[PDB]
């Protein structure tokens, strides 16, 4: 009564789950980084060859 | 009192959500509306690299 019922925290994170939240750029920024690194590597290799 | 003619009880009233789905705006939902511009910019940049 005085801890679980009186409290303000519902102990069920099973109903009303995570709604549609789009893909962040944090999963995409590291891919952009290796893209730019491969571009610069290819530029320098083409210049020295 | 007489016999009850109409039975009733306690019910739940909600906002009654409809199928409010937009059109062309629903297509560019899942990734972003701003990562695609960087994708097209990297596309034209890699084409500049190839040319």
Eight-class DSSP state of A22:
P
Report how far residue B34's alpha carbon sits from residue B28's, in angstroms, rounded to the nearest whole number. Answer: 10
Q: Which residues of B touch A43 (CB under 8 A)?
A: 49
SS3 state of residue A26: helix
Whole-number Å distance between alpha carbons of B51 and B49: 6
Q: Closest approach of chain A CAs to the CA of B46, in angstroms?
A: 8
What is the experimental resolution, given in Å to one decimal place?
6.5
Cα–Cα distance for residue pair B51/B36, rounded to 1 Å: 22
Please name the method used to determine this structure. cryo-EM
Q: Does A28 touch chain B (CB under 8 A)?
A: yes
* Contact assessment for residue B46 and residue A39, using Cβ atoms and an 8 Å cutoff: yes
A18 phi/psi in degrees, rounded to 5: -70, 115
Calculate the alpha carbon distances from B51 to A32, A35, B28, B45, B46 in Å. 21, 18, 30, 10, 9
- List the structure tokens of A29: 């920024």
**Selection from A20, A40, A35, A23 nearest residue B35 by Cα:** A23
Count CB atoms within 10 A of the CB of residue A21.
Answer: 7
Q: Name the residue with tokens 């009880």.
A: B9
> Is A39's Cβ below 8 Å from some Cβ in B?
yes
Residue B38 contacts A where some CB pair is shorter than 8 Å: yes
Alpha-helical segments (H) within A1-49: 26-48
A31 within 8 A of A38, measured Cβ to Cβ: no
């Amino acid at each position: 009564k005085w801890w679980y019922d009186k409290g303000e925290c519902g102990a069920k994170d099973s109903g009303s789950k995570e709604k549609t939240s789009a893909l962040s750029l944090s999963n995409v920024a590291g891919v952009f980084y290796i893209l730019v690194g491969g571009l610069g590597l290819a530029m320098l290799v083409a210049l020295i060859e | 009192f007489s016999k009850p003619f109409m039975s009733l009880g306690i019910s739940i009233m909600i906002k009654k959500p409809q199928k409010s789905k937009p059109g062309v705006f629903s297509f560019l939902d899942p990734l972003a509306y701003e990562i695609w511009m960087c994708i097209v910019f990297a596309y034209i940049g890699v084409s500049v690299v190839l040319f």
